[PDB]
């Protein structure tokens, strides 16, 4: 069965830092493009960022970007999302995402919390 396993989230303050770990089990992870969406309690789902197969193609919110750097481990099976300069707007679940080559796969999530 495929899961998707996020860690990495937090309570931290505006400016400070955070790296999300997406474990991924029960497919061919690097046949795939991975990815990152967030959604704040009180907004739409929203795409943060996509990494291609062997990571040379990457894609970010543009707000997000010179922020978050998306990587991947591709025998680890693990994808990666480091989050710089955070902002109190970045406060959401982040959960990542397997979004086929036509099953969608999605994690729990992991709180990200951006505050004083
Ligand atoms: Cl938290």
């Known amino acids: 069965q495929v899961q998707l396993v996020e860690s990495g989230g937090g309570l931290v303050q505006p400016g400070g830092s955070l790296r999300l770990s997406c474990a991924a089990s029960?497919?061919?992870?690097?046949?795939?493009?991975m990815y990152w969406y967030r959604q704040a309690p009180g907004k739409e789902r929203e795409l943060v960022s996509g990494?291609?197969?062997?990571?040379?193609?990457?894609y970010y919110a543009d707000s997000v970007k010179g922020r978050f750097t998306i990587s991947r481990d591709n025998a680890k099976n693990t994808l990666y999302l480091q989050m710089n300069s955070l902002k109190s707007e970045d406060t959401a679940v982040y959960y990542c995402?397997?979004?086929?080559?036509?099953?969608?796969?999605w994690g729990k999530g992991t709180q990200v919390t951006v505050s004083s």
């Open positions: 995402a397997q979004r086929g080559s036509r099953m969608d796969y």
């Open positions: 029960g497919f061919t992870f690097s046949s795939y493009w």
């Open positions: 990494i291609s197969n062997g990571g040379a193609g990457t």
